[PDB]
Design a protein around this ligand. Sequence first.
Ligand SMILES: Nc1nc2c(ncn2[C@@H]2O[C@H](COP(=O)(O)OP(=O)(O)O)[C@@H](O)[C@H]2O)c(=O)[nH]1
Ligand SMILES: COc1ccc(F)c(C(N)=O)c1F
Ligand SMILES: [K+]
Length: 305
Amino acid sequence: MATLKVIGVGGGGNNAVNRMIDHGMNNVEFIAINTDGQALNLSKAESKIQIGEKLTRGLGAGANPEIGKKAAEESREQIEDAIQGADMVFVTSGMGGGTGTGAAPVVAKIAKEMGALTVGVVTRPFSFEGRKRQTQAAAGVEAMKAAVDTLIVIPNDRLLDIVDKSTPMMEAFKEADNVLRQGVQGISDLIAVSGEVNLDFADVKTIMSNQGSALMGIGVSSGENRAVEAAKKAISSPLLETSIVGAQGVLMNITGGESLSLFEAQEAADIVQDAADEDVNMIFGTVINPELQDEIVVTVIATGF
Ligand SMILES: Nc1nc2c(ncn2[C@@H]2O[C@H](COP(=O)(O)OP(=O)(O)O)[C@@H](O)[C@H]2O)c(=O)[nH]1
Ligand SMILES: COc1ccc(F)c(C(N)=O)c1F
Ligand SMILES: [K+]
């Protein structure tokens, strides 16, 4: 079976890895990469890599992305050894600081050279962090795009659209974490489960390899318009820089119980096709889970923008 690894690079990335481990994911390996040895000592990841100790003496990169980049380059063999064997790597990092900005594209490059299908899931900083952080972050996003197979960007300003004046900051961060964690879980499920119309890791590669921007979404619904609703939730994305609009390739899977109808599978597909507003090249899958009663789940991976 295909081996999935999630790598957190820098403070925000390792935060996301810690919160995902807390949440619980059972068939994914986690790797924590950081300059900051204090944060790395608190990581819940089974594999930890301290990079750049000679450069920083165990401190972070101090907002200097060139130090992050050098620290990763100098630890290339340790990063290779930790990746070796993965079929797919997700690299998550917060752009705009020194370690994520500089080291995450090096890690992603190493993963793609090690043979892994490589997906980046990165944040852009809040506008309140100022224009220099935003410009540094943009350069990291560009570098990440050059290094990955596909890239999901989460502008942190979008979190301000989903909170009220009291929502705890940590609850907002968990919402952003969901993008990665549900994208990972959806792939894990595809690999693990045999479908009635069966998709497998080669289909993931076809949809994701060397594609650029991506969307990864899941929607769950019940009741009379469940397929349309689940499809709409899978592609909605209030947190995403890349919406579904313009997608030219899509992997879509529908999971339901024995009641899953052909008609509602077409409805779901049509929602995705119409929201793309393009002629979508679809890879369509279906899973019948007789455990499920009235629940349906639509998973979408969209690329080709
Ligand atoms: N959404 C989210 N953003 C984060 C988190 N931690 C940091 N950030 C963002 O990521 C950017 C860089 O922070 P950090 O990863 O700590 O910097 P680095 O360790 O030096 O690479 C910050 O400017 C914030 O915009 C997090 O837990 N969640
Ligand atoms: C989330 O996508 C998934 C999940 C579980 C599956 F069995 C399949 C499949 N049709 O083989 C799929 F495409
Ligand atoms: K499968």
